[PDB]
Each structure stands twice: as C-alpha cells, then as structure tokens.
C-alpha cells in the first residue's frame with residue numbers, strides 16, 4: 001500500500017471512531033466540574049452490590065455495543081469470516097472499553113464520569129472490589145498522562161482488536177494483513193503529528209490483558225447470579 005492509501009486508512013479509522021465514540025470528548029471535558037456531592041457519593045455507597053452491578057452491567061454492555069459498531073466500520077473487518085469477527089471481538093472488546101475509559105477520566109482529582117457526574121473510586125465501594133477499581137483507575141491515570149488524542153485512541157484501539165495472534169482464527173493471514181496495514185497507519189500518523197514519543201510510553205500489551213482478565217472475572221461472577229437484558233444502541 002502507498003502512503004496515499006495509508007493516509008486514507010488513517011482518516012477512515014479516525015472517522016469510524018468519531019461516529020462510535022459514545023460520549024463526545026468535548027462534553028466529558030466540560031462536565032469535569034459537575035462532581036458528585038458527598039451526599040450523592042453516600043447514596044451510591046448505600047446501594048446493594050446487586051444494584052451497582054446492574055448499573056455497571058448496563059454501562060459496560062452499552063460501551064461494548066459501541067465498540068462492536070466501531071469494528072464493523074473498520075476497513076476490512078466485515079470482509080473477515082464470521083467466526084473471525086467473533087473471535088476478535090470476544091477477545092478484544094473489553095480491552096478497548098478499558099482504553100476508551102481514559103477519556104472519561106480526570107487525572108486532576110482522580111475522578112471518572114459515571115451516570116452524569118464525576119466520582120472518585122469510593123463511589124464504587126458497594127461492589128467490594130477495591131483492588132480492581134483501583135487498578136482500573138491507575139491504568140486510566142497512566143493513559144491520561146500521555147494526553148492520548150482522539151485519533152491515537154482510534155488507531156490504538158483498532159490494533160487492540162485487529163490482532164492476528166488471537167487463538168481460534170480461521171483466516172489468520174487475512175487478519176495479519178489487516179493488522180499490518182493498521183500498524184502502518186498508526187506509525188505513519190504518529191510521524192505526521194510528531195507524536196512518535198508515545199509508542200514507548202504505551203502500556204505493554206500484557207498489562208491490558210492481565211487487567212481485562214481480572215475485570216472479566218468480576219463480571220462473570222456478577223452476571224451469573226444477576227443477568228440483565230438491556231436495549232441495543234445500533
């Protein structure tokens with residue numbers, strides 16, 4: 001592929017992200033001052049783990065819907081066989097959601113945007129998993145420190161998804177070609193934006209893996225005893 005086509009892949013990936021980014025960065029940054037009062041935080045802390053779980057399950061499911069929509073708009077993704085589409089999303093969707101979360105994270109006061117306002121990790125106390133929440137907040141903090149742009153998120157999450165080493169792929173060569181093309185796109189766009197410096201500062205692939213694995217473990221435990229059928233975005 002020529003640099004002209006690489007640049008078109010760049011523009012295409014970034015447009016697909018902007019159409020499926022769920023919350024506008026502009027809104028997130030604007031609402032940073034709308035913070036939960038102490039009474040509001042206490043209101044959340046009094047809820048059952050089962051109520052917080054269902055709210056969290058609703059937000060995660062919805063975030064995942066937007067990630068699936070992003071993938072479907074990704075050049076070449078819909079050209080993969082159905083098995084492979086499923087393999088990639090099953091392995092990668094929740095890792096993308098975790099990356100996407102850094103946009104809603106405010107490093108200045110360590111709060112995150114949740115149901116209309118910004119709250120610290122103590123908001124989630126009823127869930128009884130401080131370590132995981134803390135790990136999620138630290139991970140977001142590490143990404144926010146980089147000032148990850150909207151397009152870097154777009155290109156980086158595309159590569160989280162389009163990973164040819166996911167076990168179970170039936171057309172591994174096709175995923176490899178897609179992955180390589182997206183790598184070209186990412187690297188070229190970092191050059192064009194003078195942002196080469198972020199590559200070495202990005203979280204190791206393994207860290208996103210171990211975090212999502214710990215995350216998924218909680219989800220399974222909650223969703224087993226309390227499934228919730230909730231509306232589809234697209």
Ligand SMILES: CC(C)CN(Cc1ccc(-c2ccc(S(C)(=O)=O)cc2)s1)S(=O)(=O)Cc1ccccc1
Nearest residue numbers: 021022023056059060063100101104112136218219
């Ligand atoms: C804020 C996190 C640490 C806690 N969870 C609630 C959220 C779920 C989805 C969120 C979200 C959705 C969209 C964006 S966006 C539109 O800016 O991309 C950003 C964040 S916050 S949790 O559910 O991940 C914590 C949890 C709950 C239950 C079991 C395990 C973990």
